[PDB]
Amino acid sequence: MQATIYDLDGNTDGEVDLPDVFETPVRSDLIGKAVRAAQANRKQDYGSDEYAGLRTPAESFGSGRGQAHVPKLDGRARRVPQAVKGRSAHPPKTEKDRSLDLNDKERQLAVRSALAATADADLVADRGHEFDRDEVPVVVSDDFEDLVKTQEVVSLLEALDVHADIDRADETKIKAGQGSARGRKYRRPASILFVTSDEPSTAARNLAGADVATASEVNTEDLAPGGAPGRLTVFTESALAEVAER
Amino acid sequence: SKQPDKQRKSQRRAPLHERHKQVRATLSADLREEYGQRNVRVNAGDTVEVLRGDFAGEEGEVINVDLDKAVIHVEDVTLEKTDGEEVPRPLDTSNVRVTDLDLEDEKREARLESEDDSA
Amino acid sequence: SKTNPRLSSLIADLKSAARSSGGAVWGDVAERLEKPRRTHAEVNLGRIERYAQEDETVVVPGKVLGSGVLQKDVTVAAVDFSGTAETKIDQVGEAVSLEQAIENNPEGSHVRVIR
Amino acid sequence: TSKKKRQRGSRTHGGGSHKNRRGAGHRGGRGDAGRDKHEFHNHEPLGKSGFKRPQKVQEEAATIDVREIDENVTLLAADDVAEFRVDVRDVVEEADDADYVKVLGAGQVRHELTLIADDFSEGAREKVEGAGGSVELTDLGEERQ
RNA sequence: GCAUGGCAAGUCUAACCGGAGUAUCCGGGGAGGCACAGGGAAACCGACAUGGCCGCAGGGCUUGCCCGAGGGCCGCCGUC
RNA sequence: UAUGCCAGCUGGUGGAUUGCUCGGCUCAGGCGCUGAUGAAGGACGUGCCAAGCUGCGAUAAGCCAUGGGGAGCCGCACGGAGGCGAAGAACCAUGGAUUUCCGAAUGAGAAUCUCUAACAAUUGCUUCGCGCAAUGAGGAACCCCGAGAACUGAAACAUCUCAGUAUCGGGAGGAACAGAAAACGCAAUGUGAUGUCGUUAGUAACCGCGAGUGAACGCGAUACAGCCCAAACCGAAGCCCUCACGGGCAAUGUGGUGUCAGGGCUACCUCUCAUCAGCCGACCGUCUCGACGAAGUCUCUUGGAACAGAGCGUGAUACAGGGUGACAACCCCGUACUCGAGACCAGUACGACGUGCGGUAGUGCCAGAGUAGCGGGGGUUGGAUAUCCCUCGCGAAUAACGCAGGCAUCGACUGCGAAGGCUAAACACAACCUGAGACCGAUAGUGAACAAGUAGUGUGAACGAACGCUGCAAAGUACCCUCAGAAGGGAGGCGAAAUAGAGCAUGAAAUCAGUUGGCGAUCGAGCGACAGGGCAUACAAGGUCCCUCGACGAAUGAC
Ligand SMILES: [Cl-]
Ligand SMILES: [Cl-]
Ligand SMILES: [Cl-]
Ligand SMILES: [Mg+2]
Ligand SMILES: [Mg+2]
Ligand SMILES: [Mg+2]
Ligand SMILES: [Mg+2]
Ligand SMILES: [Mg+2]
Ligand SMILES: [Mg+2]
Ligand SMILES: [Mg+2]
Ligand SMILES: [Mg+2]
Ligand SMILES: [Mg+2]
Ligand SMILES: [Mg+2]
Ligand SMILES: [Mg+2]
Ligand SMILES: [Mg+2]
Ligand SMILES: [Mg+2]
Ligand SMILES: [Mg+2]
Ligand SMILES: [Mg+2]
Ligand SMILES: [Mg+2]
Ligand SMILES: [Mg+2]
Ligand SMILES: [Mg+2]
Ligand code: NA
Ligand code: NA
Ligand code: NA
Ligand code: NA
Ligand code: NA
Ligand code: NA
Ligand code: NA
Ligand code: NA
Ligand code: NA
Ligand code: NA
Ligand code: NA
Ligand code: NA
Ligand code: NA
Ligand code: NA
Ligand code: NA
Ligand code: NA
Ligand code: NA
Ligand code: NA
Ligand code: NA
Ligand code: NA
Ligand code: NA
Secondary structure, three states: OEEOOEOOOOOEOOOEEOOHHHHOOOOHHHHHHHHHHHHHHOOOOOOOOOOOOOOOOOEOOOOOOOOOOOOEEOOEEOOOOOOOOOOOOOOOOOOOOOOOOOOHHHHHHHHHHHHHHOOOHHHHHHOOOOOOOOOOOEEEOHHHHHOOOHHHHHHHHHHOOOHHHHHHHOOOEEOOOHHHHHOOOEEOOOOOEEEEOOOOOHHHHOOOOOEEEEOOOOOHHHHOHHHOOOOOEEEEHHHHHHHOOO | OOOHHHHHHHHHHOOHHHHHHHHEEEEOHHHHHHHOOOEEEOOOOOEEEEOOOOOOOOEEEEEEEEOOOOEEEEOOOEEEOOOOOEEEOOEOHHHEEEEEOOOOOHHHHHHHHOOOOOO | OOOOHHHHHHHHHHHHHHHOOOOOHHHHHHHHHHOOHHHOEEEEHHHHHHHOEOOEEEEOOEEEEOOOOOOOOOEEEEOEEOHHHHHHHHHHOEEEEHHHHHHHOOOOOOEEEOO | OOOHHHOOOOOOOOOOOOOOOOOHHHHOOOOOOOOOOOOOOOOOOOOOOOOOOOHHHOOOEEEEEHHHHHHOOOOOOOOOOOOOEEEHHHOOOOOOOOOEEEEEOOOOOOOOOEEEEOEEOHHHHHHHHHOOOEEEEOOOOOOOO
């Protein structure tokens, strides 16, 4: 199919052929599986002290004093799971493998399929992104990689009738629950993904909900955050081309 | 440290000299223009205007600056004790704005003017 | 509890065609596909070659693999073909998607089932 | 919902009398204990059987059946065509860590083939000749006497 | 064992290497494992890409009659 | 209707719940030795007032220098009094001063004190004099060398297993150990020091051949690095102390050469770029720390307080995180970007100085003995005839020789030279620094968020808790009455709130006081379920229900 390239003013400037991968049939299940793996693989191993609650010579008196056979020390019950200060029966364990494997084939396939999801205006609208455009993804001249001010990327977007999505991601959510106490107080909608070719868009990265990525290593997470296909993306003339062989 | 516990910790256990930065206040438009800084370490000489408390709006001369508790006493911003005495109602520099500076310190004025350092 | 939305849809289509059209093979294939993956068909060329016959579409309720040789000029319709199978088949005949078979022949006529 | 997930409130978690799930006694002993007494059922019998020749006195023949060669003669475009002629050593995988290559006679031979290997079986020769073919024995193959 | 999913006469990488958005992730790495032939203590030898019959589903026809994968019963082959 | 039962209401008791996190737990990166120049640890001191903690050490919460930092300060600790600071204090960094007693504890003795110069003790050198030096002890574990169980498994139990584990003795470092083949043995026209990681493989091997036990070569990676003596041939050409003088060592050999690309010697060829000794000496990277660092504190409403709602506007190489009287990119710290400093890498790489590599022919000159090897008895290992080691006895050759290649002997072939020595890097741990988190969130998580190894127990070894939350701000309740009263109570004052008033957020249940509804001093006990009556009931969140008659009318069905 055709891809309408845009200049930094937002005006049409020719058009290239939309590579084949964007025709890969959208497989949300595989995409989901690839996002799950990526998210699990970055989780850190944890677990309670191996000797927590065992640091005691407590012993049970046995029968004879009308007391349950519970190891005690200085008249205080100890060690056993049902005892306050006793060990945790089946606690979390450092040894546990919290990683998920995934076949390179299955994973690359999901990358392709996520890509394709990007080229369907309807999907991208369902995923929830806000925009008033008919073509998608949004392809732009490699000159974009030269921008430096965020403000300039804004204008470009407003001209491309896509800024409405950043308006969407311009709202932080203060989470329910104690994540808060661990430094996860906030969270925000995901907005536009900018895929360039030489380096990630320094000028676009700070944009609300935006994520910047490069064609050679852009992945399923960026392409489909939370495993949900159809993220409002903007490729670079060159990027678009590179992506084709992924 | 992106972790809340550490953030708060470091702020509460910061050595004396590192507390100065905790008693900083925004500078009036005129002054920001004049010294090329957005704020300054409020001193017991400056004049300042209350921007947020129950005293928001009032102005006065900074009477005291406590580095341990990171708070300042502004003249006339007080509380009525039971016995009738009048005592200062501590203020957080963050709800305050400096409108006049006491530059009796060569050093302070130096820093203020230089463009490579802030006071 | 199938996971593939595609496989899932394919099956819905196979039915709608077996119900509407007078097809009975489509409804037969649907039932096998609904069964566990392990029971699905995994057929190599060597077998198709052995029992197929021209002008009679060969229907594999599963996937076709590339071991063996195919000479007959037959039309094969599976859920999927390995890359080698589809390449080896298009050389002497035609490898077709079941979704195409259902459209070109909803009556499920002149078809031979192979597993 | 999984089975484990439905266990809360069942008390016995599927073990029957709460008296069952205790220690190894409920297993008739630790590991293969009693493989000769109470649990002899379905255990290969006790005993020594045969001998083994020292590992480095063993030869491992890399084998392949005519059917494979023959089924992909055309596809082996990168291999001699003549009045086909193929050196098996170059076809068989694992033909390096192998003490020698041997062709076996399983399947058919639908082409005239000139095969070069370190060894063949009767079946292999017969079939290859019967299809107007020939079998050439390698210099290594020169170990027949 | 099972259910789901990828690839398929194949399939998967391990440690590790490079890149990077630097514990994720993109690329590389097939060492090696399992599968592709078995039988025999060993020496050693080395198999049906289908020959016959029933017959489910499905298909065909001129509506009982053919074709009948899978399945079932034999043949036959390798080896001890 | 007393005693009393059930439920509720007000107040209490209690401290669950929800919310919060100054603490944990876990992972990750960096870094890593201290001590007779007396450590670590302990004791006792040290403040204006000072009990605990911290710091410090008779110069005692400290003295000096340099740099940074800055108008404030006098630790936790917010009192009273007093004081210090522009003579630039506080505070931070580095360096320096001081640094009681016990303590390896070292003059001798001793429960932290005492008695009349002291390396006690054992050593090395030695001016044979404690003159010069060494050792001692500590440290989270990691590491290396020795000693070495049992419960348990085998459904008993003895070999076997637990396990070379627990524990014990000795010792090093920042990493240890290992290491340049008398190797391997995909047997080869092959590989080429050593660790480690992945695999080889639960393979081979062991084993009441039960249960169980269990490698290696190789391969792929990480990191790479290779050398020095002994002797032959020289024979004092040498080394140590001292400024020097001078002394000591050394023919029982200092020093030269040389070390399987064998060497030496004799005659030659050519040459050095090997090696070894010494000089110089980083970049980058990484860890930590620091400097600078954009944009609203505008309108209206609610509110005690805007960080809320509506409106208007801004920054962004910065929309990580935190603070601030409620949800804050733009109020404050910071964050992106740029820059600087220290540490490590590393006395390494690179560079350079000196040395001289190598080759031919001749020469039976040299090449590590209780060794190789055999036997008796044990331990150990997968090691089986074929693991490694200990002990008792026996015991060889000399490169023209010797050892190995998983039974012995002889021959062949292939590998390779033991009985001397050293050796960077890649790997372990986590004390120390920093970072992180689908971990816990005050009966959890460390025993320990609090005086925590604290209070407290035990003669002792040892054992060992509980206790977090006023408020935006102390505005922490003046004045009056009462009282034996700085108690308590009343009245009153502050605050949005005091039912936020001090172990003070919220404030469950068990339960207590008072009280409302129902029952109640002639009556029977799983305390209820389903039916149906009495009595009782603010609103809200449920709105139905009753009778006449009439319509419909299953099974059943009359007087
Ligand atoms: Cl098949
Ligand atoms: Cl064997
Ligand atoms: Cl080798
Ligand atoms: Mg506990
Ligand atoms: Mg909650
Ligand atoms: Mg300035
Ligand atoms: Mg129960
Ligand atoms: Mg291979
Ligand atoms: Mg002493
Ligand atoms: Mg026993
Ligand atoms: Mg036993
Ligand atoms: Mg080691
Ligand atoms: Mg037994
Ligand atoms: Mg063992
Ligand atoms: Mg080996
Ligand atoms: Mg020498
Ligand atoms: Mg043993
Ligand atoms: Mg606790
Ligand atoms: Mg006692
Ligand atoms: Mg309360
Ligand atoms: Mg009565
Ligand atoms: Na303890
Ligand atoms: Na009791
Ligand atoms: Na793990
Ligand atoms: Na069961
Ligand atoms: Na049980
Ligand atoms: Na058993
Ligand atoms: Na028996
Ligand atoms: Na391979
Ligand atoms: Na360190
Ligand atoms: Na004190
Ligand atoms: Na000191
Ligand atoms: Na000494
Ligand atoms: Na002496
Ligand atoms: Na037993
Ligand atoms: Na017994
Ligand atoms: Na045994
Ligand atoms: Na090999
Ligand atoms: Na503020
Ligand atoms: Na012996
Ligand atoms: Na050998
Ligand atoms: Na508590």
